[PDB]
Amino acid sequence: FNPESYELDKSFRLTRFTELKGTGCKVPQDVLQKLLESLMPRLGIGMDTCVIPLRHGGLSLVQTTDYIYPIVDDPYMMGRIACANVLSDLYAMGVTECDNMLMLLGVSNKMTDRERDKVMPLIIQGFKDAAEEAGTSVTGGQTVLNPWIVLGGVATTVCQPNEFIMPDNAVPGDVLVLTKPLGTQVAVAVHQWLVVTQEDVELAYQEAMMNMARLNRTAAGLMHTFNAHAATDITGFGILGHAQNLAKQQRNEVSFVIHNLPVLAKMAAVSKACGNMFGLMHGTCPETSGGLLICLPREQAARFCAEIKSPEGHQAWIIGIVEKGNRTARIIDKPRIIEVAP
Amino acid sequence: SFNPESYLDKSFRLTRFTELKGTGCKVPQDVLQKLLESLVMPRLGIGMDTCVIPLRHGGLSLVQTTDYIYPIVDDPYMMGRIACANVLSDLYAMGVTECDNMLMLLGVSNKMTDRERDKVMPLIIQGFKDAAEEAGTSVTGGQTVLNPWIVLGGVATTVCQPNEFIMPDNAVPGDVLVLTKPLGTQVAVAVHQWLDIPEKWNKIKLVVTQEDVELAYQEAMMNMARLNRTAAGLMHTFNAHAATDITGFGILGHAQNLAKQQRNEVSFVIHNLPVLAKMAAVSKACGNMFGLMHGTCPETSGGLLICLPREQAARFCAEIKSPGHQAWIIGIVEKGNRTARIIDKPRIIEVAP
Numbered sequence: 001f002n003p004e005s006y007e008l009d010k011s012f013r014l015t016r017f018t019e020l021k022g023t024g025c026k027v028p029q030d031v032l033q034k035l036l037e038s039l040m041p042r043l044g045i046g047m048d049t050c051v052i053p054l055r056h057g058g059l060s061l062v063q064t065t066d067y068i069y070p071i072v073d074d075p076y077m078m079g080r081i082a083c084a085n086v087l088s089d090l091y092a093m094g095v096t097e098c099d100n101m102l103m104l105l106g107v108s109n110k111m112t113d114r115e116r117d118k119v120m121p122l123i124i125q126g127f128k129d130a131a132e133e134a135g136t137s138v139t140g141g142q143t144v145l146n147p148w149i150v151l152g153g154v155a156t157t158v159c160q161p162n163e164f165i166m167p168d169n170a171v172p173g174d175v176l177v178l179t180k181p182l183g184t185q186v187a188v189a190v191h192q193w194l195v196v197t198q199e200d201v202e203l204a205y206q207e208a209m210m211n212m213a214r215l216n217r218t219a220a221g222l223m224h225t226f227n228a229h230a231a232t233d234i235t236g237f238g239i240l241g242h243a244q245n246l247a248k249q250q251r252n253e254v255s256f257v258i259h260n261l262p263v264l265a266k267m268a269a270v271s272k273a274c275g276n277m278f279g280l281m282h283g284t285c286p287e288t289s290g291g292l293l294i295c296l297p298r299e300q301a302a303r304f305c306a307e308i309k310s311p312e313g314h315q316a317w318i319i320g321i322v323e324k325g326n327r328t329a330r331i332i333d334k335p336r337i338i339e340v341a342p
Numbered sequence: 343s344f345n346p347e348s349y350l351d352k353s354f355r356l357t358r359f360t361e362l363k364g365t366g367c368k369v370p371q372d373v374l375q376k377l378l379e380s381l382v383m384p385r386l387g388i389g390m391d392t393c394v395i396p397l398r399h400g401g402l403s404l405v406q407t408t409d410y411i412y413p414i415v416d417d418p419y420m421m422g423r424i425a426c427a428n429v430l431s432d433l434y435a436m437g438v439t440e441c442d443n444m445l446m447l448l449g450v451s452n453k454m455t456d457r458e459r460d461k462v463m464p465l466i467i468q469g470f471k472d473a474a475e476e477a478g479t480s481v482t483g484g485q486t487v488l489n490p491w492i493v494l495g496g497v498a499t500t501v502c503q504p505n506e507f508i509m510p511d512n513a514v515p516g517d518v519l520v521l522t523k524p525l526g527t528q529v530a531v532a533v534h535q536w537l538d539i540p541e542k543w544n545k546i547k548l549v550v551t552q553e554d555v556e557l558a559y560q561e562a563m564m565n566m567a568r569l570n571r572t573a574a575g576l577m578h579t580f581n582a583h584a585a586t587d588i589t590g591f592g593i594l595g596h597a598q599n600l601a602k603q604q605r606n607e608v609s610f611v612i613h614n615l616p617v618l619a620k621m622a623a624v625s626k627a628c629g630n631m632f633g634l635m636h637g638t639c640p641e642t643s644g645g646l647l648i649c650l651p652r653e654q655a656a657r658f659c660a661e662i663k664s665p666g667h668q669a670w671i672i673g674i675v676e677k678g679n680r681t682a683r684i685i686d687k688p689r690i691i692e693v694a695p
């Protein structure tokens with residue numbers, strides 16, 4: 001995306017139409033659980049999708065919703081990233097197919113009509129192609145004026161019981177697998193700012209951009225192939241936030257321990273230099289369109305890692321262990337930081 | 343019937359955490375259409391009120407819908423009830439009386455202190471929850487984000503057998519048009535916000551009193567929290583041919599949208615308009631701000647507009663009213679080219695509280 005390539009000015013930045021926060025835009029985890037107080041397997045609020053058994057066919061309706069604001073300055077990719085973020089919640093349940101999507105848009109009241117008319121069709125394009133890759137399509141939605149640009153949607157599947165994997169079958173000795181590297185907030189943060197070189201910055205942003213656009217759909221499928229016991233996706237609450245919520249969901253008395261952190265190279269050094277702006281090393285640094293965190297028996301684990309890389313392929317990491325415990329999660333006192341080069 | 347005193351600033355208003363416009367906040371119909379251009383059992387995609395998606399499973403099809411809005415009333419719990427009624431309002435356009443699940447869409451203003459949050463956001467949530475229970479459904483997922491504004495919406499989804507819904511495409515000449523709630527909500531909510539503004543009140547004051555505005559507001563609030571579900575069930579009983587619901591694009595914007603969908607070569611003509619008492623006078627005192635007389639005034643959680651056999655519309659109204667809230671026959675269907683209009687001098691019916 002070259003702005004001036006679209007009769008737009010030089011100073012335009014899609015990221016102008018929102019604010020940047022080190023800790024993200026979502027309402028914090030403890031506050032939501034509080035406010036959300038008045039509210040065949042079935043799954044209510046608390047996890048990555050709902051699972052609502054139906055009257056018809058012993059079928060279950062599985063659905064999920066998402067919305068975010070611009071984090072990269074390339075409108076096509078950002079819509080790809082939007083559509084991918086919605087579908088991620090489905091994939092943490094293992095459902096490889098999407099029966100239907102609805103799209104949420106918010107058009108900023110600060111953008112010229114000419115900016116809107118160039119930038120929106122690009123975004124709407126990124127969303128469609130990504131949906132096509134997922135084997136689905138958008139058939140409705142809602143579009144309204146807002147102070148900021150908003151992007152989001154709904155994914156919905158009507159499943160037979162074999163299609164999904166309840167997020168709660170972990171046992172002591174399983175290992176934790178993560179399929180995308182950490183640090184997406186830091187990378188988007190520093191790029192807008194244009195310890196690290198201008199070159200270190202551009203390679204990071206381009207890499208984070210690419211990984212955010214990649215679908216968790218292949219991973220969902222290999223969780224069946226390799227008999228996964230539970231999974232979540234890593235989004236706004238960060239690696240530790242989502243780990244802690246998965247754990248509390250377990251049927252068995254287990255606890256999670258994460259040993260190493262696969263981070264986009266150089267981004268650890270940035271978060272570190274910014275004290276408590278991010279908290280990358282504490283595990284609460286928000287992710288966007290992160291990968292899957294999966295509880296797999298030790299044998300299924302290397303095999304799963306081998307096949308995701310060389311099926312097109314993408315690397316995944318062994319990051320921690322499942323142990324007898326009281327359903328909590330924690331990162332170790334001094335984690336190993338794997339620096340993953342572009 | 344709300345006061346920030348118990349629970350906030352005596353000055354606290356919920357409608358402060360957005361920005362009110364006579365023409366509402368939607369991306370205008372026309373602009374919208376040219377942004378979406380890219381994107382056997384009957385099917386329904388983008389355009390009307392819901393999708394209808396045939397699933398490879400025992401003759402089922404997916405029916406669903408979404409919506410989001412901003413505060414238009416200062417009563418939080420009642421704002422919860424209304425944001426939910428509006429999400430469902432779309433399901434009820436297809437004659438679909440059941441809802442198999444809901445999700446919520448929630449935004450907190452980054453402008454509202456922590457005290458205000460843990461006191462106000464519960465109210466909205468319980469209202470939403472109370473509405474879903476009335477509709478015999480519940481909220482089992484959603485999304486909650488910071489925004490400059492307070493944000494309210496959600497998702498409604500049903501998995502339907504073939505005769506659970508009514509395809510909005512089978513209108514014929516001689517059919518008539520029933521409206522199930524009176525118009526003018528965008529005027530009523532506005533004027534309740536203009537009490538607190540000296541420059542706006544000084545002008546409208548020549549046209550209505552404080553008690554009348556208090557009144558039209560309270561009436562508007564109850565109508566907008568009123569579900570369309572009963573109307574939905576009666577569409578089946580009295581052989582409805584087609585319906586759409588009246589929301590952001592006004593009585594005409596949405597009448598035109600539905601006349602586009604018809605199989606037959608038919609058009610709609612609207613002869614009268616039921617409108618909350620006094621609101622149409624207020625509209626005129628404000629120039630081209632609203633356009634409540636031309637049919638381009640925004641409604642939120644407005645009514646259903648139903649094409650009914652000329653012989654049946656009358657039983658329908660009797661039934662919806664006697665057992666109840668009144669409905670009105672506002673026009674007719676005739677041979678035409680899939681368009682719709684308001685007659686030049688429409689008859690205004692002043693619905694009192």
Ligand SMILES: Nc1ncnc2c1ncn2[C@@H]1O[C@H](COP(=O)(O)OP(=O)(O)O)[C@@H](O)[C@H]1O
Pocket residue numbers: 102103104105138139140141142143378381387388389390391392407409432589590591
């Ligand atoms: N971002 C979007 N992507 C795809 N379809 C959309 C989007 N926004 C709105 N729509 C669809 O456009 C049509 C008109 O929108 P709207 O006026 O909001 O009607 P409704 O509330 O009755 O669905 C509807 O079918 C709606 O689902």
Ligand SMILES: Nc1ncnc2c1ncn2[C@@H]1O[C@H](COP(=O)(O)OP(=O)(O)O)[C@@H](O)[C@H]1O
Pocket residue numbers: 032036039044045046047048049064065089235236237445446447448481482483484485486
């Ligand atoms: N306003 C709301 N109403 C109902 N459920 C909600 C709401 N906000 C969040 N949730 C639910 O609370 C849980 C936490 O939200 P979130 O972290 O956004 O989940 P996820 O990222 O897995 O989609 C999710 O299960 C979500 O469905």
Ligand SMILES: [Mg+2]
Pocket residue numbers: 047048088089092232233234235
């Ligand atoms: Mg998730």
Ligand SMILES: [Mg+2]
Pocket residue numbers: 065066085089235
């Ligand atoms: Mg999510």
Ligand SMILES: [Mg+2]
Pocket residue numbers: 141142143408409
């Ligand atoms: Mg809508």
Ligand SMILES: [Mg+2]
Pocket residue numbers: 390391431432435586587588589
């Ligand atoms: Mg509608």
Ligand SMILES: [Mg+2]
Pocket residue numbers: 408409428432589
């Ligand atoms: Mg609607």
Ligand SMILES: [Mg+2]
Pocket residue numbers: 065066484485
């Ligand atoms: Mg979420």
Ligand code: NA
Pocket residue numbers: 047048049050064065089483484
């Ligand atoms: Na979810």
Ligand code: NA
Pocket residue numbers: 140141390391392406407408432
């Ligand atoms: Na809809």
